Amino acid sequence: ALGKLQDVVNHNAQALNTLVKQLSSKFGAISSVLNDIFSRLDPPEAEVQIDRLITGRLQSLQTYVTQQLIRAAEIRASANLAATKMSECVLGQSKRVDFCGKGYHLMSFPQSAPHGVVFLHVTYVPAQEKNFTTAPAICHDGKAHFPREGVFVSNGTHWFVTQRNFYEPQIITTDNTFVSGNCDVVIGIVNNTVYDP
Amino acid sequence: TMSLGAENSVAYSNNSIAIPTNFTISVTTEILPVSMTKTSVDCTMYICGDSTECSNLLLQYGSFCTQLKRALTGIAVEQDKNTQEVFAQVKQIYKTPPIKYFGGFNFSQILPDPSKPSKRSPIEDLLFNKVTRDLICAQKFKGLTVLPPLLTDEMIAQYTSALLAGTITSGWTFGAGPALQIPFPMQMAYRFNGIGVTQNVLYENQKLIANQFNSAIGKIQDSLSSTPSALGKLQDVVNHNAQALNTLVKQLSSKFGAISSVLNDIFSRLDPPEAEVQIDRLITGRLQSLQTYVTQQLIRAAEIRASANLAATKMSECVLGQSKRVDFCGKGYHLMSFPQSAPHGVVFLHVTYVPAQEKNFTTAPAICHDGKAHFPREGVFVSNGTHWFVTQRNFYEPQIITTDNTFVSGNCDVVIGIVNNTVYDPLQPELDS
Amino acid sequence: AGCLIGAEYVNNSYECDIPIGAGICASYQTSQSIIAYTMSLGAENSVAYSNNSIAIPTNFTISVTTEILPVSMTKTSVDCTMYICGD
Amino acid sequence: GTGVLTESNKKFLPFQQFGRDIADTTDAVRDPQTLEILDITPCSFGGVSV
């Protein structure tokens, strides 16, 4: 479950554990203890044999620094993404799909975590679907009526207008339908009665 | 001296408004790299080619062979994750319906074609036929192996076909829960309500928009075929990986302070007490040379990971949902986006809404009828010179100014630009009759 | 990719647990033995697209998901003197 | 070096004796005693994954 927050710790652990193992590895020399080379060689040969270890250790340290820079860039990108999610998912209701959870974003709750943050995204997921019969628009008194903020559904016998994400049957009044054009330009229009309150 | 374009100075007037009268649906293409060639090397064979004496020194030189092999291993797992987070975003693999009548839009070029054995769309056929002892086998004999990707070319084509199935049949409700059946004419009718244009435009001008979409898709195949440098963003990834492998194999014939690069000749033309002095030069230079490859591979993988995360965000905000971010899903008002597989990448087909045929009118902030200032509820007050009408903000549709499309707030004393028109109350003719 | 000596190829498709290569995936399922199966991309659902058909939801299921994003890192600090020259 | 000496069909030149691939690797050598075109392919290697 907490894989990435453990992977970032294991990567910093294996980087330090690899750097200490290179300390006890002769990079082309006669030994690995620096305090012993100075007691088994003359200064002429000491300056020669000690450089082959100092250079190797400096190269290993530069490699470690480069790996740390790349990892810090990756973690900076991740932290920028987490801050963007914090400002959009927690400090508001973002409409970006898949950004704040898998579904219709409603709210988010940030939680502290070792070297990270755990977002609790509350998403809206519909269920219990049902097939209906729909039409682009309806015709009445010669003029075509289009849905305002919904969809024209039908249960087989009657026609109603509901929401686009939740079923709520309502009568087709002259307050939720606007008129535009005649009933000879829309392909698929059905006939009905738009009751006026 | 390069010019930044032509001058198109707009005549800004206090009472001048420009409302477009016609639409121009355009399908743009955006190419983003998603993955790369998963490379893997062998420390022993590359550093010490068929040399047993060299291999003995490599073990005592340090454990640097394990750090490089572990670093390249993480890159291989990264590329499998990149193709898993972008193309694989839906659980149920949706299938296209048997009927292909989707209101009047012809998706024959983007839907998978079962005629050819590869089962790919005609547009994807052009993509895979464009992006390109031989060089491949030569690199294998030196340790430069190329691991095959987890997702095959057929599985990626099936992942993209499932997204296209849910984009046409389900719409935008297939990536945020269970798929919901909806007609395609009614699907784009709700995708217009996100850009301001009401749904009384697609239902009326259905045949016109259908012809513009079918013609725009045909131009996609022509643009990619005519222009040679079209899939250049994906070739740059291939060329960088090829140049990196051609340079890493070239440094093998480079003397890093030695007499020659042939490890066999050094041991035969010299003696062990003297050969150990010069053999340390090549084992250090070749190990540093391989270190540079791993270093440049980690940096290049971060550039592709940023493009893979952008492609994952782009395929989730443009394909399975309508995005209101400007310029994100193509240049223009985003309507749809159809993903298509490509060699080491993905090619989006952003269907954008671009207005055209603009006409100049006269505007006013509010109108005064009986002392109360009437403000537009969802449109803009325009005038052809004599009469005043309220139209949409992205499509010219002359409508009468009733009490149902204008609200009242305050009096006509503080609004700068108030005019004197007459609104039509919808109850006066009904009460009179 | 290569020769997989040790597993058996089963025609039944399952979710990928151990990635092998080019669709091949391994798992320890039923004496149980390591098997090799083609990676299944998911189920095979078919939306019934009709000219007059809509699927309006009737109920909702409020769900809470969790995402894990790294933020910080252990601020390592090395010593050039003691690491390179140990005492 | 090591490899698997096999037959080939490379049309060498009279003065040419050795051979090379695209990037610095001997691919074929003419036999000294009996003139014939061979093919030098490295012996079988590969990675092992458990």
From Swiss-Prot, chain C:
Sequence similarity: Belongs to the betacoronaviruses spike protein family.
Technological use: Main component of the anti-COVID vaccine Chadox1/AZD1222/AstraZeneca; in which the human tPA leader sequence is added in N-terminus to enhance protein secretion.
Further facts: Variant D614G has become the most prevalent circulating sequence in the global pandemic since April 2020. The mutation is associated with higher viral loads produced in cell culture and animal models. It would not change pathogenicity nor neutralization properties vs vaccination. May be prevalent because the mutation increases virus transmission in human population.
Protein name: Spike glycoprotein
Annotated glycosylation sites: 11, 30, 51, 59
Domain notes: Contains sequence and structural motifs very similar to those of a bacterial superantigen and can directly bind and activate T-cell receptors. Activation of a broad T-cell repertoire may be involved in the hyperinflammatory syndrome in acute COVID disease.
Source domain of life: Viruses
Disulfide bond annotation, renumbered to this chain: 16-25
Phenotype for residue 58 to I: In strain: Alpha/B.1.1.7
Reported impact of residue 46 to L: In strain: Omicron/BA.2.12.1
Organism whose genome encodes this protein: Severe acute respiratory syndrome coronavirus 2
Modification after translation, per record: The cytoplasmic Cys-rich domain is palmitoylated. Palmitoylated spike proteins drive the formation of localized ordered cholesterol and sphingo-lipid-rich lipid nanodomains in the early Golgi, where viral budding occurs.
Subcellular locations according to the entry: Virion membrane; Host endoplasmic reticulum-Golgi intermediate compartment membrane; Host cell membrane
